Amino acid sequence: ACDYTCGSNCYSSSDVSTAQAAGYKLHEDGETVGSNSYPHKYNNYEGFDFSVSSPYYEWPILSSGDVYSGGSPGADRAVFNENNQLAGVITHTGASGNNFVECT
Ligand SMILES: Nc1nc2c(ncn2[C@@H]2O[C@H](CO)[C@@H](O)[C@H]2OP(=O)(O)O)c(=O)[nH]1
Ligand SMILES: [Ca+2]
Numbered sequence: 001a002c003d004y005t006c007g008s009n010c011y012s013s014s015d016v017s018t019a020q021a022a023g024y025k026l027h028e029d030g031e032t033v034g035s036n037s038y039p040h041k042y043n044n045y046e047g048f049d050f051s052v053s054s055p056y057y058e059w060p061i062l063s064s065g066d067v068y069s070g071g072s073p074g075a076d077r078a079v080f081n082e083n084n085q086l087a088g089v090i091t092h093t094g095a096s097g098n099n100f101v102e103c104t
């Protein structure tokens, strides 16, 4: 079973932990990858009810199981905060334009 389902994508907690660890490390070292410069601040325009404190940062999580390194980011994102706490897993899949909806 999936711990997180983003559209047709199935993720386990380990997938998210691995993605988050890579994103958080880049954030701490003040480095970014990809033309869209990940990881970067997530403003929460959507108004999701995150249970952890801000600031929030978004980092791509890939369906292939591979850690994002600069190519096409896809539709799914792991959102973490300054204390390395997972805020949530979101996706553009099933959402209009560049909006996000939460993964179930
Ligand atoms: N939809 C959305 N985009 C955000 C948010 N925070 C930052 N962004 C960025 O604002 C712009 C319009 O959505 C994009 O550059 C998007 O970045 P990403 O495209 O890298 O997610 C947010 O809370 N919601
Ligand atoms: Ca997996």
Ligand SMILES: [Ca+2]
Pocket (backbone or CB within 6 Å): 064, 065, 066
């Ligand atoms: Ca692989």
